[PDB]
Amino acid sequence: IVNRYEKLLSQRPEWHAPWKLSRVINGHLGWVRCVAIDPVDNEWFITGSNDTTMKVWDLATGKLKTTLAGHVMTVRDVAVSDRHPYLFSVSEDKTVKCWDLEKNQIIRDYYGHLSGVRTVSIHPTLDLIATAGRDSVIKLWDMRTRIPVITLVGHKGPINQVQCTPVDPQVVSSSTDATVRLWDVVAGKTMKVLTHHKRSVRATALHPKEFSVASACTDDIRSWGLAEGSLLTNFESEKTGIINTLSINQDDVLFAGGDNGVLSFYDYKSGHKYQSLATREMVGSLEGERSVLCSTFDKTGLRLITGEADKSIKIWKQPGLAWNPN
Amino acid sequence: YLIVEESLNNVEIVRSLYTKWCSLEPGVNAWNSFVDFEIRQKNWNGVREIYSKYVMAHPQMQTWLKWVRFENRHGNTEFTRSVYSLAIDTVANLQNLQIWSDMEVAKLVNSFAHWEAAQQEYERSSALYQVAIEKNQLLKAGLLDFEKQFNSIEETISYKRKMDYETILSNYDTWWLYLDLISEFPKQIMQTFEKAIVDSKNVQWKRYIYLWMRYICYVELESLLEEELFQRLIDDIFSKIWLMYAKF
């Protein structure tokens, strides 16, 4: 309609600074298909991989702190907790393990997932984590009693990212069924099922200050306030690659990594793509490989960290692009 | 669902369904289907409304054309005209670039002009083209076409101007052509000629000489200017030119 387009044209987005590559830390001998940082501090960030390991990394130096070898198969995801000094990690060996960070050694392997487990999210407020695998089910664990407390049946296929919010919409799943769910853990049921994607929403992330949750199928990055479970915006992601990552920055600077490796940045809520970045790879590696598989920002937000399939981790420092809608 | 309804031959329900479908900003195809259905039904009251709705939902100039075509098929000439006006008005109204390509608007304008021509009164077409010009190349072309169809002198002049512009863009032969066009308002032409001269190895020299000669001729037709030209030539530095100057 003309009534909306005109309005869109009238409104302007804020000039977010562009992004330039800063650090590249070829250290893993495998994909680096998870990355995470400490809520409390931003000194280190760990990165689980197809190595089977996960390595810890000092941001400032870029130096490899230490390794951790508590899986058999490849690590798919990790989550350092704000409220406790535990690092949860999870691998396609079906193990959702829990590393003490006072001793850097596993403690509570949680057992229950029938098959390769894709993501963890620690609940920001509770002493409870949430994991989901190709199982097609998101189980919540009491961390003390290392048992699945509840489980969330709804989904009809493998479930990827499964973020935890502190409100009522306490889990924000995202499947290959292309539904992204909002659940009520307490009710033992769904509350609202965002079906707006076309394909496997293989990426989703909570906004820090804004109580919303960007989510990405093969192209269209939707983003939504999950209070009602209502759409907020659609991003200009029109011919970008298969969106692997979908991290959001503190300053409303949503990042999206592709299977292409084209690092695409967007103003959040606007839905305005305001940068593209061509990937890079090593002289030995192939041009098809290069692809940002996992990524996240620091708590401040000036450094984006992208794990790419070059067996690398690339950290990114910081005139905006013209609007032009449909 | 629609086909089932058709088979049944209960039509109100089908209509309702169609309406519902069309409220969900569906495909152009759906809209077209709906239109077809409406046509098939006896009434042509409501079809217009639906078309309007479609247009509103799909700001696309092809839609407008389609609507017009329906109007044409229908008996009323006034209605078509009104529709055209509305289309034009809508295009005008969004001055901001929230728009279908400038080719599509041009096309629409052309169509309107054609319609007008087919109708009794031609002034209207001319007016429309003037309006178009005021609010580019495509538009100009359309205007020219309209003129041809039909004022003729004006059209010719416009064409000449366009040609001159093209020549300038391309840019000795071109310069000459431009000069000729200018010769074919007088003050403006003179200015243009002067500019060309200013703009203006052996070949180049020859061209320059020719230009100078032309200028001299112009002056004659119209002494100080000639003197100035001579001075300029001298500075640049021919014998023939000097002789001519002396004679003058």
Binding site: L232 | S23, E25
Partner: peptide, 24 residues
Amino acid sequence: DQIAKNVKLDDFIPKRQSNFELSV
């Protein structure tokens, strides 16, 4: 009518696209 009730237009519409200062 029932069908219409079942699926509404505002679902397809993003809410932020109209109002930017609006924040959840």
